[PDB]
Design a protein around this ligand. Structure first.
Ligand SMILES: [Mg+2]
Ligand SMILES: [Mg+2]
Ligand SMILES: [Mg+2]
Length: 430
DNA sequence: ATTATGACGCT
DNA sequence: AGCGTCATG
């Protein structure tokens, strides 16, 4: 009744750049614009591995994690851009720099949480209150929402996509109560107006297009963002949740696309998120633990409390390279050379980070994988990071991992290493 | 022979 | 601390 909380206290947006690395390459090279194109890492093995795909290329079935040679079988005219290689490894600096450009624009509208290289959550609650105060009870025109979809509409008693979008928006706006400054639906709508403005600013000032979701929490905003891509935004209201979730596979909700989600499905014998409502909070906690159970109980009703953290910068700065199959490192010279390459890239990135962001990392994490281990990381060990010096950092990493060499010989390394990873962590202001 | 990251939970 | 899970450009 009146005391059952409904999780409608915040306005949260998730902004996600469309096919991000592709857009960075298309800005730089106009010949790639409005073409089926993909971004690849490396080239010798099967043409390189695709990591980002333009929407034109997706129409042919090209996806991430596909080898370029196979993508070319699906789309012979596919255009490819290669990630830069420095010190023998992929170097993602261009995309990190482009990400900073976008995150700085977003931060003008509200405090953001950098969730990944190309996506950020936005807490718009206060900005919405402000814009509502300025509105003075004036209604929201559909002209202010030119790329917004309202999930679940139109409904009830034209065969073109834009026409359907507009009918849904008109139904939504007609049902809006514009005088209640505390109406959650009105707050979401104003949030969407703000996000239209933020997305327009990103495109004007960078050239990059993005999609966005607007809802009452991070999980719904992320889900909403995915409903209409690319270059569109979607409002998921609290009221839209029962219908949306009634046919939503559990794996589509963030955090449930892996083992936990598969166990929800198998243990409870359900398929869709809405089916979770039939279980008590204690039942869900008994199966999935106290934290997961309470989270599932609320989430399946559209309610989630995780805050938008005020954090625009990554918490760690890392450098990683796999040495698959026959390229695995089997000599101490090899291991030292690659640790040095990784450490030199890490030093460059850390020095730039210290100048830009007034902080210093204090912990170096070294991770390796040995040949034949199913896990992605075979061993992880930390040591002190007291100086931004690549030779020191690589020597320290070698000292930390050298007891892993099973070889009786000091020159050989066995079993050979299939992955090296150096990560700087535990930043302190300076 | 996917790869290169990056966040966060568990114990 | 070191490990596992989830994401997924
Ligand atoms: Mg994206
Ligand atoms: Mg993203
Ligand atoms: Mg993606």
């Amino acid at each position: 009744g009146p005391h059952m909380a409904t999780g409608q206290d915040r306005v949260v947006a998730l902004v996600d750049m469309d096919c991000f690395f592709v857009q960075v390459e298309q800005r730089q090279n106009p010949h790639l614009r409005n073409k089926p194109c993909a971004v690849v890492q490396y080239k010798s093995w099967k043409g390189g591995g695709i990591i980002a795909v333009s929407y034109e290329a997706r129409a042919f079935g090209v996806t991430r994690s596909m080898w370029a040679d196979d993508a070319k079988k699906l789309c012979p005219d596919l255009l490819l851009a290669q990630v830069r290689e420095s010190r023998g490894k992929a170097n993602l600096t261009k995309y990190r720099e482009a990400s900073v450009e976008v995150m700085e624009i977003m931060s003008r509208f509200a405090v953001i949480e950098r969730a990944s290289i190309d996506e950020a959550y936005v807490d718009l609650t206060s900005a919405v209150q402000e814009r509502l105060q300025k509105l003075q009870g004036q209604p929201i025109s559909a002209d202010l929402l030119p790329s917004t979809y309202i999930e679940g509409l139109p409904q009830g008693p034209t065969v073109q996509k834009e026409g359907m979008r507009k009918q849904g928006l008109f139904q939504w706006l007609d049902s809006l109560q514009i005088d209640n400054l505390t109406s959650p639906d009105l707050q979401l709508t104003v949030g969407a107006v703000i996000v239209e403005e933020m997305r327009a600013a990103i495109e004007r000032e960078t050239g990059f297009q993005c999609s966005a979701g607007i809802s009452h929490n991070k999980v719904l905003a992320k889900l909403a963002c995915g409903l209409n891509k690319p270059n569109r935004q979607t409002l998921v209201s609290h009221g839209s949740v029962p219908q949306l979730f009634s046919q939503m596979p559990i794996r589509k909700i963030r955090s449930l696309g892996g083992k936990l989600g598969a166990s929800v499905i198998e243990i409870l014998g359900i398929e869709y998120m809405g089916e979770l409502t039939q279980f008590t909070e204690s039942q869900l906690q008994s199966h999935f633990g106290e934290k997961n159970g309470s989270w599932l109980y609320a989430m399946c009703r559209g309610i989630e409390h995780d805050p938008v953290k005020p954090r625009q910068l990554p918490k760690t700065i890392g450098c990683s390279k796999n040495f698959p199959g026959k390229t695995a490192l089997a000599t101490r010279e090899q291991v030292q050379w690659w640790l040095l390459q990784l450490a030199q890239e890490l030093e460059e990135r850390l020095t730039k980070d210290r100048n830009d962001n007034d902080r210093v990392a204090t912990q170096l994490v070294v991770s390796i994988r040995v040949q034949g281990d199913k896990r992605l990381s075979s061993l992880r060990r930390c040591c002190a990071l007291t100086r931004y010096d690549a030779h020191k950092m690589s020597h320290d990493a070698f000292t930390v991992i050298k007891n892993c060499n099973t070889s009786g010989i000091q020159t050989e390394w066995s079993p050979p290493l299939t992955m090296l990873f150096l990560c700087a962590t535990k930043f302190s202001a300076s």
